[PDB]
Amino acid sequence: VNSFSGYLKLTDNVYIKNADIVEEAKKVKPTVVVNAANVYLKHGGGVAGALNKATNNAMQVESDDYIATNGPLKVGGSCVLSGHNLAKHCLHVVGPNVNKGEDIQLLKSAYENFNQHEVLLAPLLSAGIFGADPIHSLRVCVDTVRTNVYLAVFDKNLYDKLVSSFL
Numbered sequence: 313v314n315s316f317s318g319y320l321k322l323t324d325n326v327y328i329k330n331a332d333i334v335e336e337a338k339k340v341k342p343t344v345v346v347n348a349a350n351v352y353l354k355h356g357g358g359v360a361g362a363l364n365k366a367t368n369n370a371m372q373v374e375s376d377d378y379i380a381t382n383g384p385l386k387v388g389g390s391c392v393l394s395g396h397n398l399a400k401h402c403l404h405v406v407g408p409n410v411n412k413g414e415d416i417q418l419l420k421s422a423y424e425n426f427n428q429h430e431v432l433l434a435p436l437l438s439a440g441i442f443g444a445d446p447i448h449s450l451r452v453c454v455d456t457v458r459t460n461v462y463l464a465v466f467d468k469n470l471y472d473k474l475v476s477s478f479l
């Protein structure tokens with residue numbers, strides 16, 4: 313259960329590893345995997361596309377049914393759906409996409425959703441092509457998340473810059 317390996321503990325509740333979140337989910341089958349979602353839960357590329365491809369599109373079929381019945385999420389919001397073969401549950405969280413003018417204050421609301429789950433495997437919210445400064449996203453995670461979060465960052469260069477900034 314939640315057999316995370318090779319993480320570096322940064323704080324009492326934040327751990328980090330240079331790894332593909334999809335490979336970590338396949339190995340660990342955690343209780344919760346976090347998806348870096350958008351408000352219509354369309355998993356077209358990046359982390360969301362990779363997690364969806366690893367479920368062979370089951371995540372996308374389920375997300376479409378959630379959207380049809382409940383409507384879109386808001387930026388900073390989340391929903392809990394099945395984790396299929398990757399985890400017991402998938403927590404779809406929408407961080408702001410600064411490359412599109414969404415406010416950075418919503419990154420704190422996005423990480424606050426992690427607090428409803430004791431243990432989570434997660435990506436660094438709003439980083440990559442969402443345009444937020446990735447070291448700033450790690451500072452918001454550290455100051456906002458109180459439950460146990462295991463961050464998988466699939467880039468050794470960025471992992472080293474995050475760990476150098478933190479230590």
Ligand SMILES: CC(C)[C@H](Nc1ncnc2[nH]c(-c3ccc(S(=O)(=O)NCCO)cc3)cc12)c1ccc2c(c1)S(=O)(=O)CCC2
Nearest residue numbers: 332333348358359362436438439440441442464465466467
């Ligand atoms: C900052 C960056 C290093 C980080 N990336 C990632 N972090 C952690 N696990 C990751 N897996 C992949 C991946 C991609 C594609 C594929 S593939 O389907 O092309 N190849 C399949 C081979 O089995 C296979 C894994 C990316 C990745 C990240 C963190 C946050 C965000 C992004 C990206 S974003 O997707 O640009 C926008 C949403 C916010």
